[PDB]
Amino acid sequence: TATLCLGHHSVPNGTIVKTITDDQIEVTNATELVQNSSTGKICNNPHKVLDGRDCTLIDAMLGDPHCDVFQDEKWDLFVERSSAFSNCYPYDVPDYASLRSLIASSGTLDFITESFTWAGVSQNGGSSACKRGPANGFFSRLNWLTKSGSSYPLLNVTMPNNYNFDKLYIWGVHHPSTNQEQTNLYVQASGRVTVSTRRSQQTIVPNIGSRPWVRGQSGRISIYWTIVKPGDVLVINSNGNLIAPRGFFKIRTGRSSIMRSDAPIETCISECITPNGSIPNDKPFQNVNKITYGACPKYVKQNTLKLATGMRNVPEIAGFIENGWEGMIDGWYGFRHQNSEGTGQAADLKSTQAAIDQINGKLNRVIEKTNEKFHQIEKEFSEVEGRIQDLEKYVEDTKVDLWSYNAELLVALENQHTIDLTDSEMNKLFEKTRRQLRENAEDMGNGCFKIYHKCDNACIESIRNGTYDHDIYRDEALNNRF
Amino acid sequence: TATLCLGHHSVPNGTIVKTITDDQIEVTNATELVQNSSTGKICNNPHKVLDGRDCTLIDAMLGDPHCDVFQDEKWDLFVERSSAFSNCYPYDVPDYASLRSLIASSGTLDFITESFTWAGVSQNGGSSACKRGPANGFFSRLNWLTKSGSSYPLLNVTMPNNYNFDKLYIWGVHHPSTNQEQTNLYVQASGRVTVSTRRSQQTIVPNIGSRPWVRGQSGRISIYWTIVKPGDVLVINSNGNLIAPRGFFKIRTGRSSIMRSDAPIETCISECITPNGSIPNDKPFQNVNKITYGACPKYVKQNTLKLATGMRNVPEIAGFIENGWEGMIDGWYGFRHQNSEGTGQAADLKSTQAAIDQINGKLNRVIEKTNEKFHQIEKEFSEVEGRIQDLEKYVEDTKVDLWSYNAELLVALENQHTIDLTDSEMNKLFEKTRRQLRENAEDMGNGCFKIYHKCDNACIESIRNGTYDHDIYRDEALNNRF
Amino acid sequence: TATLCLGHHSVPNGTIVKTITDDQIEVTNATELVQNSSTGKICNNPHKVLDGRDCTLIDAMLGDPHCDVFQDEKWDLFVERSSAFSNCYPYDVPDYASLRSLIASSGTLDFITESFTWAGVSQNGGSSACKRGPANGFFSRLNWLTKSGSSYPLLNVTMPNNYNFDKLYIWGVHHPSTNQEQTNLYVQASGRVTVSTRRSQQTIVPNIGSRPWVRGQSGRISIYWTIVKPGDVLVINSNGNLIAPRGFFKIRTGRSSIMRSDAPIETCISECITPNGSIPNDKPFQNVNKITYGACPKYVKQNTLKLATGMRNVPEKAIAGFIENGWEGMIDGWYGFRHQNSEGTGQAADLKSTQAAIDQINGKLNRVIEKTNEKFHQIEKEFSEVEGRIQDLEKYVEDTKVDLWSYNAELLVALENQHTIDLTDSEMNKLFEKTRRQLRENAEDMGNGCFKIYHKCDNACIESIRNGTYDHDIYRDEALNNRF
Ligand SMILES: *[C@@H]1O[C@H](CO)[C@@H](O[C@@H]2O[C@H](CO)[C@@H](O[C@@H]3O[C@H](CO[C@H]4O[C@H](CO)[C@@H](O)[C@H](O)[C@@H]4O)[C@@H](O)[C@H](O[C@H]4O[C@H](CO)[C@@H](O)[C@H](O)[C@@H]4O)[C@@H]3O)[C@H](O)[C@H]2NC(C)=O)[C@H](O)[C@H]1NC(C)=O
Ligand SMILES: *[C@@H]1O[C@H](CO)[C@@H](O[C@@H]2O[C@H](CO)[C@@H](O[C@@H]3O[C@H](CO[C@H]4O[C@H](CO)[C@@H](O)[C@H](O)[C@@H]4O)[C@@H](O)[C@H](O[C@H]4O[C@H](CO)[C@@H](O)[C@H](O)[C@@H]4O)[C@@H]3O)[C@H](O)[C@H]2NC(C)=O)[C@H](O)[C@H]1NC(C)=O
Ligand SMILES: *[C@@H]1O[C@H](CO)[C@@H](O[C@@H]2O[C@H](CO)[C@@H](O[C@@H]3O[C@H](CO[C@H]4O[C@H](CO)[C@@H](O)[C@H](O)[C@@H]4O)[C@@H](O)[C@H](O[C@H]4O[C@H](CO)[C@@H](O)[C@H](O)[C@@H]4O)[C@@H]3O)[C@H](O)[C@H]2NC(C)=O)[C@H](O)[C@H]1NC(C)=O
Ligand SMILES: CC(=O)N[C@H]1[C@H]([C@H](O)[C@H](O)CO)O[C@@](O[C@@H]2[C@@H](O)[C@H](O)O[C@H](CO)[C@@H]2O)(C(=O)O)C[C@@H]1O
Ligand SMILES: CC(=O)N[C@H]1[C@H]([C@H](O)[C@H](O)CO)O[C@@](O[C@@H]2[C@@H](O)[C@H](O)O[C@H](CO)[C@@H]2O)(C(=O)O)C[C@@H]1O
Ligand SMILES: CC(=O)N[C@H]1[C@H]([C@H](O)[C@H](O)CO)O[C@@](O[C@@H]2[C@@H](O)[C@H](O)O[C@H](CO)[C@@H]2O)(C(=O)O)C[C@@H]1O
Ligand SMILES: *[C@@H]1O[C@H](CO)[C@@H](O[C@@H]2O[C@H](CO)[C@@H](O)[C@H](O)[C@H]2NC(C)=O)[C@H](O)[C@H]1NC(C)=O
Ligand SMILES: *[C@@H]1O[C@H](CO)[C@@H](O[C@@H]2O[C@H](CO)[C@@H](O)[C@H](O)[C@H]2NC(C)=O)[C@H](O)[C@H]1NC(C)=O
Ligand SMILES: *[C@@H]1O[C@H](CO)[C@@H](O[C@@H]2O[C@H](CO)[C@@H](O)[C@H](O)[C@H]2NC(C)=O)[C@H](O)[C@H]1NC(C)=O
Ligand SMILES: *[C@@H]1O[C@H](CO)[C@@H](O)[C@H](O)[C@H]1NC(C)=O
Ligand SMILES: *[C@@H]1O[C@H](CO)[C@@H](O)[C@H](O)[C@H]1NC(C)=O
Ligand SMILES: *[C@@H]1O[C@H](CO)[C@@H](O)[C@H](O)[C@H]1NC(C)=O
């Protein structure tokens, strides 16, 4: 007689995962699917990262003197720091967020000076709240007009767009603190500013009243913008309180954006940037921050998700029935034989290769490699606003919940199918071996066959290869069994 | 000889479910996953529910006399009734929804009086449209200023924030019906109101014109609000038409919200509130209302979803092949034996336990227990508005469709796997029994084994336990079978 | 002895699909789930499609002369062309998109004229920028008021809503180019327009200043609207610069909408319309356009998704069984028997297992996904100008929805293919095991899916085995001598 047993490998330290059917099952190998940490640094490649330091994007656009270093800059990602401050004439922007988003998306601050003529007024007004060295100054891209002599005439100027790209104009209106100041700077008791194209118009009447002192001044300035398409024309008509433009900004379509962060910038390479720093993108999910730029993993709420990579781990001649082989390091499935010569062991390459090829590349079949997103909505707020902020928060929360559910279900399903396939492979190998031994062998019921004839080492090798001929040993076996 | 059959339990009345593969299959037990009814009452525990009977939140905030009972109230959920009405001076709020949302989210009406000084004007103006008993009155939190003698001087007042929390100020502007009324109440022919901090400013010019009578009055009032951060200062500068504040409201961050409902409030306990009433949250899905507050099931479009909790139900010695055992009430899987002593029956505990432990707790592996949401967007509207309302409706519709698809797919998948696992358990038990009987038994092909030796009750019990020794009965069987 | 083999059909040209476990597996039949093409025409049935031609919806509402043919029209879908233009007095609409969406959703332009009284002013002002034939004209639904003699008195007019439906009023304000023009047309140096109900009010002060010439004019007009509920009243109070309404529009609730397209309209039937044209809706997914109207498939990013309809396709390499071998010579069913005997070889098919497999395969996708979701009026999804916050939010919402539905479609196809392959394999194995059960001890398995029967099993014996009425005892003893 002889013994031929079939078995599968096991490891001393396994990992616990979750399936559709079982909450905890131990397997021989697993991988983590959620990225949960960052180095805390922002890499300067391959995206062009521009550090704003102590300047906001709007202050750099307007021409705050301590931001003069930012003239005509370009970026892929503009990083705004929390220590930024303003040091010029106090101002406000109706719909600040929209202008900020527009400028950030455009990705450039290229400015072209134009030859405006302002007949009968003084130009280049200044203030002690915006100092350029020792002298009083103002925003570098704006022109503060006041009366000349004792008159402030009606201004009526035009500028056509004879290029083939769009023009962006930034202009403003001054709000004085008293009626006496209004008459002192602009002769008329009530100013008016009108800015129009062939398809749009805006008219502003200034507001008068005392306000809290900011850098010594109780007056204010309001900022507005206008876009002029190719073939159109801009007309400015005003009888007081005009803060004139000095030229226009180019506006482009691209993949630029802006981000708030305090992380330092270092020399390295990374495709995914968050406010916490750069993160690697080899995993499909991340838990670091829902604000991202570049090729990034999808944000989820879970901090860990384990995907099974090997078969179930069963502690440890016998077969595979509730028994694993801790002494096998040559493969996943294999044979053992007990004989007159002695015990021997070998592995099955075909079933191991089939299992590995099935397991490898599993998650790429369902989920995409990397989703690249560049400019998105704001997801953190500093002031309370109401309806629109509520809607933005609701949208983000809904998206996060749905993607977290997707990730959980996908991991559970994949683990279930991996376990099932490994078990089926083992059973198929056992059944094929049973098919080869037609009537000369019997199943012991523990995954092990007993062969009734003399099966030496060459006999076992013939069985393992698949060239076993039962007829040769048929009659003898029929004598041993009955 | 003897007969040993394997079988599974059956029930007289089963339930229909749907799987991935079959449109309808009958099982022995199932559970409903969608909650589709409410008692029609709102429970007063554990959330603090405040009923605004005849008052809206805005009217209670401003100080409508018939809302005077609501001064300095707090809530977790404010319930607005459809029979609420206004009984004071006619008014309107630019961006009513935003102020309503922010007050509701704050969750309190705590008001602190401040000592404003208004020099040269008369205070506490009233109207017959807002009666406090027999006398003419006004909103309790606002101060109506008019001329004193024959003059209305320029008002210029300031108030600093020396606390460590934010302040909310409510103020207003009066719109008269005629120019004569304008000059009669405020000496100047055109009023103006300016309210500012160091970081913001608002200026309002009143509108003059006749309007439809409301409680005898053709004039109107417009309401505005301002938030003052710690370390900032509020400045009010007015030439006329000012409705002054009397103090400030505390504004907080929390989980409070507001709801429109007509359901009565009763003494009970429930964690999930809808406009239809309170609902239990033991099920993962609900169909009652997409407006919810608290720990609630997810809203879906389906009114019923059945999850299988038992094996397939097959109508009814024989085995398990296309035959169930209605006479088995001691377990799920079991043995029957036919012998010289007589027929006998028993149940298998291990396979039953494995099946039950697999079935129990299946849905908790994929879906979360309860998602708590407190303040969300509005989902029902009474007027047509356009762009923003279209966006809100679109967002809600997208969310509902995606979650309904998720629920349908999850139920189908879980039912498929439950059926598969029960079938596999039965087959495994049969194969194990076949393994134990090595050569002394024959498979009848109906799920039954024919034993060709004398197998008495003790022999049956040895087979069932797993201690059956074939060698003892080997030779005799070989004589009987051949 | 005799031979009995079990096998399954195969085809000379199979199709590749993807499952959860395999990147590529070849099956005998598959179907495409994504619609990726259109005929380029919009069908005029069953929806009512109205071609705007050279007019926008707002211009047709206001009464632009070259749009006069659109008076009192109705639609289910309004189609705006890219060659539309305006040919009247220059104007602008604050919140243009909201008014456009409201009118498009209402679905009608039914107008009722009312008898307003404007005492002390002249009516029916016109311009050379808006010509009706040879004469100067104006919008047909608006009345341009102007001074009479040397005075422009204060106007207070009222109109009550005594019906049981809502009223929509469109009105406007004129912005002159100079102060002299302001005093010439309206005596007062600063005009004012107030429009109010019991629950709302709006007041407009006109703006003065020079603007670029549009059809000879530097002045402008601004357009506003007001809704009056049943039992309410409208009051108009003005002392200059008013563009008065002539009546009211009916406003309805329904499923009407508007779409931008240049596709021509033809006589045909189709339930789903896109800017590219009509598309059939027999498939659950589409890749043509994310803008749709009617009963339409869900938009996804993938251009193809193949769902398996048959079993795995195995080529055909002494008859053999189903083990790594298919039967190209079988055209009568999916699973079948073959027998080798003294009379000769014979073949037959199994009807029960084939029927079970087909009934499982048929109608699988309808169990999970709904047939058709009908959507009528939605948000805008393409923009011509940069705006900022709201446009960013709309684009973000649409992108999120598209990504989630694409993931759903991919996962569903993979899961369904996996289960189809599993069910076909299980059916074949079950048939083989049943056949093994019938031959209790009278036959031996060769291990290639084929049994060999030790006794004399003729054609009638084969048929008895196939039917399920084979009795082993009859041939028991004889086989027990052949085997041992
Ligand atoms: C309408 O109401 C507003 C608000 O109340 C008034 O605005 C105030 O106007 C006064 C006068 O212009 C302002 O007073 C000035 O404040 C400056 C800043 O003060 C800060 O810094 C100093 C020292 O750094 C601190 O001590 C102080 O507490 C503040 O923290 C001062 O620097 C100015 O000093 C000038 O006057 C002093 C007088 O002794 C001279 O010695 C100095 O050399 C210098 O000339 C000055 O005191 C006040 O800040 C404004 N308030 C606000 C909130 O901005 C309007 O004036 C009022 N309008 C009318 C018509 O009444
Ligand atoms: C600008 O245009 C508007 C719109 O027409 C005009 O506003 C109207 O002004 C008049 C005069 O002030 C208002 O008339 C008053 O209406 C009150 C409410 O009437 C309702 O209730 C009564 C009884 O409950 C009903 O019979 C009636 O049909 C209404 O349902 C009346 O109570 C007032 O009564 C006073 O006058 C009568 C006259 O006999 C006396 O007997 C009374 O004691 C009392 O003194 C009064 O009739 C009218 O309501 C306003 N209309 C609207 C829509 O509000 C402006 O006049 C106009 N501007 C100018 C400058 O002309
Ligand atoms: C404030 O600033 C604005 C902006 O500059 C000024 O607006 C301009 O006003 C002038 C005067 O009315 C306008 O001039 C007129 O332009 C018409 C259109 O010109 C177009 O078409 C012609 C031929 O088709 C082209 O050659 C031309 O380049 C344009 O493409 C002309 O048709 C008018 O012609 C009149 O004058 C000629 C003079 O020879 C006569 O022969 C004609 O019969 C006719 O009477 C006229 O030239 C100009 O278009 C306005 N510009 C814009 C951009 O709108 C304001 O005038 C200014 N306000 C003040 C107070 O200064
Ligand atoms: C262009 C111009 O007029 N610049 C002035 C400026 C403005 O007049 C003012 O900011 C408009 O609100 O004001 C400057 O300052 C003045 C002080 O020097 C003076 O003591 O008080 C004035 C207020 O009553 C005013 O603040 C400034 O901003 O530096 C002077 C500058 O030339
Ligand atoms: C604080 C004050 O002036 N209160 C007045 C009030 C206002 O003057 C008015 O609401 C401003 O629009 O008006 C009161 O009523 C008046 C009537 O008594 C009078 O017959 O007609 C007036 C209109 O021309 C006005 O309606 C009121 O609202 O009760 C009187 C109150 O003292
Ligand atoms: C109802 C009316 O007053 N219609 C005028 C119209 C308006 O006065 C004007 O559009 C208001 O801005 O203007 C018309 O044209 C005028 C020219 O004929 C004239 O040479 O120059 C005027 C400007 O100073 C004005 O453009 C028009 O629009 O056709 C004449 C019409 O009767
Ligand atoms: C990445 O940075 C964010 C900053 O927003 C961290 O999130 C905050 O974490 C603190 C500490 O737990 C909380 O108090 C805040 O409420 C969090 N903010 C938000 C918006 O969630 C986050 O923990 C950081 N992640 C890593 C891995 O460093
Ligand atoms: C819960 O209350 C809502 C009220 O919004 C009910 O929904 C309405 O039901 C009526 C009657 O079928 C319809 O005419 C309305 O169109 C429904 N409104 C909406 C917004 O869908 C709902 O039926 C109630 N549910 C239960 C279980 O009582
Ligand atoms: C249906 O029409 C849309 C029009 O938007 C086509 O999408 C455009 O295709 C062109 C050509 O590749 C691109 O340059 C544009 O960027 C696309 N626009 C958008 C918004 O995606 C689309 O290809 C058409 N589909 C069919 C099947 O004809
Ligand atoms: C576990 O699987 C990963 C593949 O994801 C492989 O890189 C790793 O070497 C495996 N671990 C062991 C111990 O084989
Ligand atoms: C059906 O299953 C539920 C558990 O989901 C259990 O409470 C109930 O008793 C079962 N019904 C029967 C008849 O066993
Ligand atoms: C493939 O399946 C479709 C239905 O899914 C059927 O119409 C078609 O005839 C099938 N092809 C063949 C060759 O049977």
Residue numbers in the entry:
A (entry chain C), B (entry chain A): 12 to 327, 337 to 502
C (entry chain B): 12 to 328, 336 to 502
Cite, word for word, the article reporting this structure.
One of the key factors for host jump is the switch in sialic acid receptor-binding specificity of the virus, mostly determined by amino acid residue substitutions that occurred in the receptor-binding site (RBS) of glycoprotein HA. The discovery of a degenerative codon at position 228 in the human H3N8 A/Henan/4-10/2022 HA protein sequence, which may encode an amino acid residue G or S, suggests dynamic viral adaptation for human infection. We find that the human-infecting H3N8 HA has a dual receptor-binding property with a preference for binding to avian receptor, and the G228S substitution slightly increased binding to human receptor. We then solve the structures of the H3N8 HA protein in complex with the human receptor or the avian receptor, and identified the structural basis of H3N8 infection in humans.
Next, we solved the apo structure of the HN/4-10 H3N8 HA by X-ray, and the complex structures with avian or human receptor analogs [LS-tetrasaccharide a (LSTa) and LS-tetrasaccharide c (LSTc)] by cryo-electron microscopy (cryo-EM). Comparative analysis of the overall structures between the G228 and S228 variants of HN/4-10 H3N8 HA revealed a remarkable similarity. In the structures of H3N8 G228 and S228 HAs complexed with the avian receptor analog, the receptor adopted a trans conformation and established robust and extensive interactions with RBS residues. These interactions included several conserved binding sites in H3N8 HA, such as E190 and G135. Importantly, the presence of the “avian signature” Q226 also played a vital role in binding to the sialic acid (SIA-1) and galactose (GAL-2) moieties within LSTa. Notably, glycine is present in AA 228 of all other H3N8 strains. Nevertheless, the HN/4-10 H3N8 strain studied here remains predominantly an avian influenza virus and has not yet fully adapted to humans, as it retains Q at position 226 in its HA.
